[PDB]
């Protein structure tokens, strides 16, 4: 992750890291459906909020273990 940190440093950009392992639903890559309270965005939007620039560096974590269990 410090590789991504220093690449954000080299091009003067802002880093963020988000964990995406253990995410087998589209409810946490994408958000949740707009028909109830408790709808909650995906992890990329979490990174994007917690970083402070238009064009950040988004770190996708534990992507080897991607599989389809539920929610497609």
């Amino acid at each position: 992750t410090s590789l991504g940190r220093s690449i954000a440093r080299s091009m003067n950009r802002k880093f963020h890291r988000i964990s995406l392992g253990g995410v087998r639903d589209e409810a946490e890559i994408r958000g949740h459906r707009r028909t109830y309270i408790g709808a909650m965005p995906g992890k990329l939007i979490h990174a994007m909020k917690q970083v402070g620039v238009i064009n950040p560096v988004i770190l996708l974590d534990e992507i080897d273990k991607m599989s389809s269990d539920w929610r497609g």
């Binding site: 459906r33 707009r34 028909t35 109830y36």
Partner: protein, 72 residues
């Protein structure tokens, strides 16, 4: 008069369907209701479209099934 008798209750329905199932789904939902006739829907295909329209707009609850009929 047929457009009145299949439209007046669409402004009455939307008025009682405001945010029902999802206001964000309301704009999509009305786009579907106009495209049920605008696009060349086979009578039966348009018929199943309008039955699901009778299924949609759920003032039962804005449930997952409301998103089911919206995605339908």
């Amino acid at each position: 008069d047929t457009n009145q008798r299949e439209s007046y209750l669409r402004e009455q329905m939307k008025a009682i369907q405001k945010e029902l199932g999802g206001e964000d789904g309301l704009s999509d939902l009305e786009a579907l209701r106009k495209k049920i006739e605008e696009v060349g829907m086979p009578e039966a295909v348009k018929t199943k479209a309008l039955k699901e329209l009778d299924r949609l707009e759920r003032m039962q609850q804005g449930s997952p099934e409301a998103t089911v009929a919206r995605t339908y």
